[PDB]
Write a protein that holds these residues in place. Structure first.
Motif, PDB file in Angstrom:
ATOM      1  N   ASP A  57       0.839  -1.192   0.000  1.00 38.15           N
ATOM      2  CA  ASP A  57       0.000   0.000   0.000  1.00 38.15           C
ATOM      3  C   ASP A  57       0.879   1.249   0.000  1.00 38.15           C
ATOM      4  N   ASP A  59       0.332   4.444   1.062  1.00 38.75           N
ATOM      5  CA  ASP A  59       0.240   5.475   2.103  1.00 38.75           C
ATOM      6  C   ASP A  59      -0.091   5.027   3.527  1.00 38.75           C
ATOM      7  N   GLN A  61      -2.725   3.814   4.708  1.00 40.21           N
ATOM      8  CA  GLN A  61      -4.166   4.016   4.983  1.00 40.21           C
ATOM      9  C   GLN A  61      -4.930   2.983   4.171  1.00 40.21           C
ATOM     10  N   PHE A  62      -5.767   2.227   4.836  1.00 43.42           N
ATOM     11  CA  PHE A  62      -6.414   1.087   4.256  1.00 43.42           C
ATOM     12  C   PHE A  62      -7.946   1.193   4.331  1.00 43.42           C
TER      13      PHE A  62
HETATM   14 CA   LIG Z   1      -3.811   3.216   0.918  1.00 46.59          CA
END
Ligand SMILES: [Ca+2]
Ligand SMILES: O=C(O)C[C@H](NC(=O)OCc1ccccc1)C(=O)O
Ligand SMILES: [Ca+2]
Ligand SMILES: [Ca+2]
Ligand SMILES: [Ca+2]
Ligand SMILES: [Zn+2]
Length: 316
Positions: A57, A59, A61-62
Motif C-alpha cells: 500500500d 500510504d 491508509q487502508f
Molecule cells: Ca492506501
C-alpha cells in the motif's frame, strides 16, 4: 521483507476502523513484526495461485473497499496470536513462533475459507451467502486453529477424528471471539454469513440442531458426505463444550457450567497432551476428563461437569 515497523489505519469488512501493524520499505506492507516471526497478509487478486503478493500500500491508509478483507485477515490473525500466547502460553501455531501467512481475495465469488497446510486463505463470498470471510474473527481463529491442530493432535480429517478437528476449531474460534469481546456469542460465522438475513449463522454451538447438525451421538451422521460429516458431527462436540462452559440440562442430563476460561484450559490441554491423529469421540471424553483431572483434581466440580456434558450428548 526487511524494513521498519509502522502502524497503519484502515477499515475492516464491517466498516469498523482499526490500527494495523505494517512494515515500511518503499511501500507499506501488511507485515506485523510485533508478533513472533511475523504475520504476513497477501493479495490473491481473485486467482487461485497462492500465496499471491505480499500486500503493498502506498500510504499506510487502508480504507478502500478492496482493502477491507486484508485489514481484517491481518488484524484478526494478530488477535488470535495474542489469545494463544496470553491465554495458553503458545507461541504461534507450531509453538515456536512460525510466521503466520494469510491470503485474501482468493478466487471469485468464493464462499469459503481454509487452512491449506501452510497458510490461511479467504474468499470474498458471493455477497449473498457470505461477505468476505476474514470479516469474522471466529472464522479467522477457526482457520488458525486448524494449524494448531495439525502441529499438535494431528486429528485426521475424516469421520470422528475429523469432527473433533472441526469442533476444536469452532471452540477456539469462539473463545478467541470472546477474548476480543466484540459482540461475542456461541454461534459460528454470524458476522459474515447472509448479509440479507439478521440473526443467523452457519453453525451454532449452543443449539447445533438449529442448523440441522446433531446435538447427540444417537443423531450422528454415518455417511460419506463431507469427509464422513466433519462439519456435521462437530455439533455433538460443540454442544458438549458449550455445556461445560455455560451449563444446562440437555436430554434430561444436567450440567453445571464452569465457564469459558476453564473450558479453554481443559480442551487446550486435551488437544496438546492427550489426543492423537485417530482419536474418536469416546477418546476425546477420556482426554478431557484426564485434562480436567490434571488441572483441578479428580474430585473437582470441573471433572464432574466434563462427564455430565459428554453424558448429555451421549458420548461414553
Ligand atoms: Ca492506501
Ligand atoms: O469446507 C472447507 O473447505 C473448509 C472449511 N471452511 C469453511 O467452512 O469456510 C467458511 C467458514 C469457516 C469457519 C467458520 C465459518 C465459516 C473449514 O474451515 O473447515
Ligand atoms: Ca459474534
Ligand atoms: Ca461467533
Ligand atoms: Ca446473516
Ligand atoms: Zn474447519
Amino acid at each position: 521483507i526487511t524494513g521498519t515497523s509502522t502502524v497503519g489505519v484502515g477499515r475492516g469488512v464491517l466498516g469498523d476502523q482499526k490500527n494495523i501493524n505494517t512494515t515500511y520499505s518503499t511501500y507499506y506492507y501488511l507485515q506485523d513484526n510485533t508478533r513472533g516471526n511475523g504475520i504476513f497478509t497477501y493479495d490473491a487478486k481473485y486467482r487461485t495461485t497462492l500465496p499471491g503478493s505480499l500486500w503493498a500500500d502506498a500510504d499506510n491508509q487502508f480504507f478502500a473497499s478492496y482493502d477491507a478483507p486484508a485489514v481484517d485477515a491481518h488484524y484478526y490473525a494478530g488477535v488470535t496470536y495474542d489469545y494463544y500466547k496470553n491465554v495458553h502460553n503458545r507461541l504461534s501455531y507450531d509453538g515456536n513462533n512460525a510466521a503466520i501467512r494469510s491470503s485474501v481475495h482468493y478466487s471469485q465469488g468464493y464462499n469459503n475459507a481454509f487452512w491449506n497446510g501452510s497458510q490461511m486463505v479467504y474468499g470474498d463470498g458471493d455477497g449473498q451467502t457470505f461477505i468476505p470471510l476474514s470479516g469474522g474473527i471466529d472464522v479467522v481463529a477457526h482457520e488458525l486453529t486448524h494449524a494448531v491442530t495439525d502441529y499438535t493432535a494431528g486429528l485426521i480429517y475424516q469421520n470422528e477424528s475429523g469432527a473433533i478437528n472441526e469442533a476444536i476449531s469452532d471452540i477456539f474460534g469462539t473463545l478467541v471471539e470472546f477474548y476480543a469481546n466484540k459482540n461475542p456469542d456461541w454461534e459460528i460465522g454470524e458476522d459474515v454469513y447472509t448479509p440479507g438475513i439478521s440473526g443467523d449463522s452457519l453453525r451454532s454451538m449452543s443449539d447445533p440442531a438449529k442448523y440441522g447438525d446433531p446435538d447427540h451421538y444417537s443423531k450422528r451422521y454415518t455417511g460419506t458426505q463431507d469427509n464422513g460429516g466433519v462439519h456435521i458431527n462437530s455439533g455433538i462436540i460443540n454442544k458438549a463444550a458449550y455445556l461445560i462452559s455455560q451449563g444446562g440440562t440437555h436430554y434430561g442430563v444436567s450440567v453445571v457450567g464452569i465457564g469459558r476460561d476453564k473450558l479453554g484450559k481443559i480442551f487446550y490441554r486435551a488437544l496438546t497432551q492427550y489426543l492423537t491423529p485417530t482419536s474418536n469421540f469416546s477418546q476425546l471424553r477420556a482426554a478431557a476428563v484426564q485434562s480436567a483431572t490434571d488441572l483441578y483434581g479428580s474430585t473437582s466440580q470441573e471433572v464432574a461437569s466434563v462427564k455430565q456434558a459428554f453424558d448429555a450428548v451421549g458420548v461414553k
